[PDB]
Amino acid sequence: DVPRDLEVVAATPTSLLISWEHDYPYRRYYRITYGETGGNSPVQEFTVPKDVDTATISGLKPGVDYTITVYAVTSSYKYDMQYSPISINYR
Amino acid sequence: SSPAWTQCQQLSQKLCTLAWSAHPLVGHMDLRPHIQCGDGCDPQGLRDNSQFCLQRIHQGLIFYEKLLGSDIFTGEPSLLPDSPVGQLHASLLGLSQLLQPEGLSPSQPWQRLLLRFKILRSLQAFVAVAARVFAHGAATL
Amino acid sequence: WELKKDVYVVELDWYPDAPGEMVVLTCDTPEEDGITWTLDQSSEVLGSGKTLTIQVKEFGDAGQYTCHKGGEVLSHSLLLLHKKEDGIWSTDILKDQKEPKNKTFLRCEAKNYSGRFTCWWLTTISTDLTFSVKSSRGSSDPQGVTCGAATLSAERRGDNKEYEYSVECQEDSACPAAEESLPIEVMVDAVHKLKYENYTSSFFIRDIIKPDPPKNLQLKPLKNSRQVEVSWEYPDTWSTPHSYFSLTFCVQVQKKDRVFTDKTSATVICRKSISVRAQDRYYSSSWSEWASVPC
Numbered sequence: 385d386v387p388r389d390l391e392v393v394a395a396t397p398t399s400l401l402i403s404w405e406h407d408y409p410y411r412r413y414y415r416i417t418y419g420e421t422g423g424n425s426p427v428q429e430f431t432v433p434k435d436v437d438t439a440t441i442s443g444l445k446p447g448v449d450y451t452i453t454v455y456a457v458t459s460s461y462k463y464d465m466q467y468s469p470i471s472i473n474y475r
Numbered sequence: 476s477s478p479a480w481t482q483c484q485q486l487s488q489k490l491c492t493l494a495w496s497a498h499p500l501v502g503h504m505d506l507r508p509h510i511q512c513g514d515g516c517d518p519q520g521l522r523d524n525s526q527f528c529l530q531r532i533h534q535g536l537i538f539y540e541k542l543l544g545s546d547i548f549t550g551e552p553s554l555l556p557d558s559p560v561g562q563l564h565a566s567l568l569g570l571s572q573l574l575q576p577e578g579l580s581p582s583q584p585w586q587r588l589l590l591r592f593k594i595l596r597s598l599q600a601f602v603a604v605a606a607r608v609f610a611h612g613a614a615t616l
Numbered sequence: 617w618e619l620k621k622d623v624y625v626v627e628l629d630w631y632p633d634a635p636g637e638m639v640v641l642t643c644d645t646p647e648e649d650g651i652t653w654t655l656d657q658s659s660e661v662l663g664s665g666k667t668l669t670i671q672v673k674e675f676g677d678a679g680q681y682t683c684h685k686g687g688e689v690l691s692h693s694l695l696l697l698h699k700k701e702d703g704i705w706s707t708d709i710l711k712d713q714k715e716p717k718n719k720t721f722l723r724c725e726a727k728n729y730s731g732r733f734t735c736w737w738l739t740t741i742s743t744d745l746t747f748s749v750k751s752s753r754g755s756s757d758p759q760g761v762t763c764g765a766a767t768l769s770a771e772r773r774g775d776n777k778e779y780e781y782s783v784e785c786q787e788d789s790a791c792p793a794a795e796e797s798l799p800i801e802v803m804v805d806a807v808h809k810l811k812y813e814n815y816t817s818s819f820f821i822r823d824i825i826k827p828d829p830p831k832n833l834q835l836k837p838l839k840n841s842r843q844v845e846v847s848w849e850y851p852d853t854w855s856t857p858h859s860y861f862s863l864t865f866c867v868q869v870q871k872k873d874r875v876f877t878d879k880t881s882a883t884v885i886c887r888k889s890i891s892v893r894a895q896d897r898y899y900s901s902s903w904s905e906w907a908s909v910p911c
């Protein structure tokens with residue numbers, strides 16, 4: 385997980401400040417999800433407007449690998465263009 | 476006789492850009508006239524005889540300019556200031572003119588919003604075919 | 617309903633109460649003598665006569681029903697159960713991918729405009745699973761698409777114990793340059809032991825395109841200039857001719873410093889690292905994975 389396009393800018397023992405680059409102008413807004421890498425926890429999510437490329441993920445747990453994913457939401461139609469998600473694993 | 480391949484390539488590329496520049500749908504969501512193989516818009520077909528393909532492209536462009544200038548698009552609910560429909564329409568006109576210079580009803584507003592999405596999706600597919608045609612023609616003819 | 621020769625699917629509204637459906641099985645024989653019926657490996661006679669009426673409520677009611685006469689086996693029928701819970705058909709077998717969107721069980725991708733694509737799905741289950749894949753373009757006057765056999769493709773300690781299956785399909789009469797009119801439909805029959813489930817996906821190839829990364833990425837020094845010439849090639853799998861199926865590229869040195877180009881070359885200042893990705897020039901679809909070279 386060496387090069388980046390979604391990255392952790394800042395971090396505390398209970399949080400992560402993430403950042404990413406806009407790549408699909410046909411986006412409506414972004415969807416962020418996060419949960420323990422092992423996937424034994426539920427995966428929490430929130431949305432961000434189209435023009436925002438930064439976020440804070442609070443209340444995390446130390447010594448816990450977290451998989452953070454970001455999606456460029458277009459719509460949810462059977463035939464609308466659906467872009468691939470981008471993610472990283474942290475701590 | 477030369478349909479100005481380079482200018483057509485540049486215009487068709489801009490049409491592709493415009494068509495994907497903005498998402499059509501609003502705060503709105505839901506889950507649920509084509510260039511065919513026989514139309515000769517494939518490389519081998521453009522090689523032999525390009526007039527067939529270009530006539531099919533011209534007809535498609537006129538088809539979309541008519542839809543974009545219709546009450547589906549003009550009129551309520553009014554298009555947002557970020558809509559590329561204005562520019563798309565002008566570019567469709569621009570291109571149709573370079574090809575041949577010399578010379579099904581909206582009712583409820585929720586139905587126009589969905590129709591606009593559908594037309595624009597179909598337009599994206601069409602313009603991409605046209606862009607590949609003009610790029611290949613520019614490079615090989 | 618019949619899912620293949622001698623294999624039946626029941627359809628049950630699954631609730632803790634459930635009266636569970638009356639099913640009439642018919643012995644395949646001419647007929648009306650000393651016929652008896654058994655279920656699975658049990659010798660227990662369930663009934664006699666050309667037909668047997670079963671109250672199908674649980675998996676204990678499914679399995680192989682066999683009819684017999686004069687010490688001979690006459691016919692056998694396998695019953696599977698398709699559960700409908702709170703009005704929705706079960707999806708216990710496959711895990712939801714959530715990748716392009718939510719409730720996403722099947723994920724399909726195409727590397728080019730040839731009518732060839734791949735579909736994949738995930739499961740927690742390793743044993744007694746069978747899948748069958750079918751596909752067509754359109755529903756009405758369906759046009760053929762041929763799929764290969766479904767196969768394990770990856771297996772990724774217990775918390776993260778997941779199996780990935782895949783299938784490759786090819787549209788029978790594909791025309792890569794054409795504007796698609798009707799979508800491709802994909803259907804997966806999943807059977808775990810005596811439990812039946814079905815999954816489906818619908819899409820246009822243009823929408824599932826994701827090119828492979830650019831190839832032969834290279835750095836070439838420039839003469840009376842002190843920056844490098846970055847060069848690369850279209851991937852081998854991409855559709856040809858490239859003069860028609862054009863790509864666009866993104867060059868990144870490591871916001872971080874990014875350049876966009878339709879050319880297969882760019883000139884950058886390599887510090888002490890350079891990445892390139894590709895996308896269809898005219899439609900859009902997903903950007904390819906990055907290709908990197910160290911500065």
Ligand SMILES: *[C@@H]1O[C@H](CO)[C@@H](O[C@@H]2O[C@H](CO)[C@@H](O[C@@H]3O[C@H](CO)[C@@H](O)[C@H](O[C@H]4O[C@H](CO)[C@@H](O)[C@H](O)[C@@H]4O)[C@@H]3O)[C@H](O)[C@H]2NC(C)=O)[C@H](O)[C@H]1NC(C)=O
Pocket residue numbers: 617618619625627698750803805814
């Ligand atoms: C995915 O899952 C669904 C749910 O299980 C499944 O739908 C079922 O498929 C069968 C066949 O397509 C349906 O049966 C049909 O409907 C009626 C009643 O059965 C009839 O018109 C037909 O049945 C047969 O009847 C006779 C034999 O009993 C014969 O004359 C002849 O063989 C007929 O075919 C017809 O097949 C069944 O009703 C649906 N279920 C629902 C809820 O409607 C679907 O097929 C699955 N997909 C795949 C790829 O298998």
